[PDB]
Scaffold this active site. Structure first.
Site, PDB file in Angstrom:
ATOM      1  N   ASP B   6      45.158  37.643  35.183  1.00  0.00           N
ATOM      2  CA  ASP B   6      44.526  38.145  36.398  1.00  0.00           C
ATOM      3  C   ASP B   6      43.176  37.450  36.502  1.00  0.00           C
ATOM      4  OD1 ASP B   6      44.640  40.439  38.568  1.00  0.00           O
ATOM      5  OD2 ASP B   6      42.623  40.568  37.755  1.00  0.00           O
ATOM      6  N   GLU B   8      39.695  36.765  38.481  1.00  0.00           N
ATOM      7  CA  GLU B   8      38.757  37.238  39.486  1.00  0.00           C
ATOM      8  C   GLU B   8      37.909  36.062  39.961  1.00  0.00           C
ATOM      9  OE1 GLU B   8      38.778  40.360  40.659  1.00  0.00           O
ATOM     10  OE2 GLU B   8      40.367  40.958  39.262  1.00  0.00           O
ATOM     11  N   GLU B  55      32.789  41.405  50.083  1.00  0.00           N
ATOM     12  CA  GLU B  55      33.997  42.197  49.901  1.00  0.00           C
ATOM     13  C   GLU B  55      34.350  42.317  48.421  1.00  0.00           C
ATOM     14  OE1 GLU B  55      37.911  40.588  51.272  1.00  0.00           O
ATOM     15  OE2 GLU B  55      38.126  42.560  52.194  1.00  0.00           O
ATOM     16  N   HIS B  60      35.195  45.640  42.742  1.00  0.00           N
ATOM     17  CA  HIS B  60      35.035  46.113  41.366  1.00  0.00           C
ATOM     18  C   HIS B  60      33.635  45.920  40.791  1.00  0.00           C
ATOM     19  CE1 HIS B  60      35.752  42.036  39.632  1.00  0.00           C
ATOM     20  NE2 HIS B  60      36.677  41.937  40.569  1.00  0.00           N
ATOM     21  N   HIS B 156      36.891  46.828  32.050  1.00  0.00           N
ATOM     22  CA  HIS B 156      36.488  46.661  33.438  1.00  0.00           C
ATOM     23  C   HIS B 156      36.625  45.195  33.824  1.00  0.00           C
ATOM     24  CE1 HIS B 156      35.077  50.740  33.462  1.00  0.00           C
ATOM     25  NE2 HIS B 156      34.048  50.590  34.276  1.00  0.00           N
ATOM     26  N   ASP B 161      43.021  44.649  35.096  1.00  0.00           N
ATOM     27  CA  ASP B 161      44.215  44.344  35.872  1.00  0.00           C
ATOM     28  C   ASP B 161      45.273  43.689  34.997  1.00  0.00           C
ATOM     29  OD1 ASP B 161      42.999  45.174  38.387  1.00  0.00           O
ATOM     30  OD2 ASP B 161      42.009  43.212  38.479  1.00  0.00           O
TER      31      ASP B 161
HETATM   32 CA   LIG Z   1      41.979  41.560  39.026  1.00  0.00          CA
END
Ligand SMILES: [Ca+2]
Lengths: 61, 174
Positions: B6, B8, B55, B60, B156, B161
């Site tokens: 995942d 980011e 956004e 997160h 976190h 994810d």
């Molecule tokens: Ca993610």
């Protein structure tokens, strides 16, 4: 796993720098709850390191 | 060994190349061997090289000042490459992550070929779409569906994810 908690402290402590750009919803008091007293000593310095970072922002060159 | 990832990034582009003008900020990958978590998780942070998207910030919580001291993609290029080279890449909406990955790879100017040439890229969203047609197949949606908690987790960021996706992946292929 010790630094796993530590690295997250630096993440949350960075939210205080976004205060210089309060153009978007940013709960500065949320970090006060997310960051427990067990890391207040680390958070104290984290604030100093982050408050000086927002001054220069990024600056590549 | 199965690798769940995942990635980011500093927001996504709605027009043209969803990765153009953007950079990777956090890399979270978990290792799954024999349907069990080995604990060999790869969690690193990268340099934004720009400002975080408004956004993405609300998604997160991530500030640019946090990714300042952290290394860039250039410092972990070979490190991450060897970690996933010749393995199964289970990602949600692989077109997103892989697109950014290859993007950063080309920025290195090392003639590095697309990740899909040395790694088996398999999207979990495609699987979920086939299983639940016309239903919300987001990570949080699947999480609630398989009764997985993604709110009371210490991890976190992308690592959160990745962990969740791993559990979902094993649940669907269980
Ligand atoms: Ca993610």
């Amino acid at each position: 796993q010790t630094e796993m908690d530590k690295v997250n402290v630096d993440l949350a402590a960075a939210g205080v720098a976004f205060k210089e750009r309060y153009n978007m919803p940013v709960i500065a008091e949320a970090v006060e709850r997310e960051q427990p007293e067990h890391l207040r000593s680390w958070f104290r310095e984290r604030l100093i390191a982050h408050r000086l970072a927002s001054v220069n922002l990024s600056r590549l060159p | 060994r199965q690798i769940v990832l995942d990635t980011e990034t500093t927001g996504m582009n709605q027009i043209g190349a969803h990765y153009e003008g953007h950079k990777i900020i956090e890399i979270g990958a978990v290792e799954v061997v024999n349907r069990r978590l080995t604990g060999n998780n790869f969690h690193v942070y990268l340099k934004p090289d720009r400002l975080v998207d408004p956004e993405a910030f609300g998604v997160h919580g991530i500030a640019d000042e946090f990714l300042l001291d952290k290394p860039t993609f250039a410092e972990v290029a070979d490190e991450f490459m060897d970690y996933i080279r010749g393995a199964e890449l289970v990602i949600h909406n692989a077109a997103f992550d892989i697109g950014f990955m290859d993007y950063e790879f080309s920025l290195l100017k090392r003639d590095i070929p697309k990740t899909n040439t040395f790694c088996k890229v398999t999207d979990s969203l495609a699987v979920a779409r086939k299983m639940f047609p016309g239903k919300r197949n987001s990570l949080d949606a699947l999480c609630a569906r398989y009764e997985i908690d993604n709110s009371k987790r210490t991890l976190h960021g992308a690592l959160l994810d990745a962990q969740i996706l791993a559990e979902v992946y094993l649940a669907m292929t269980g």
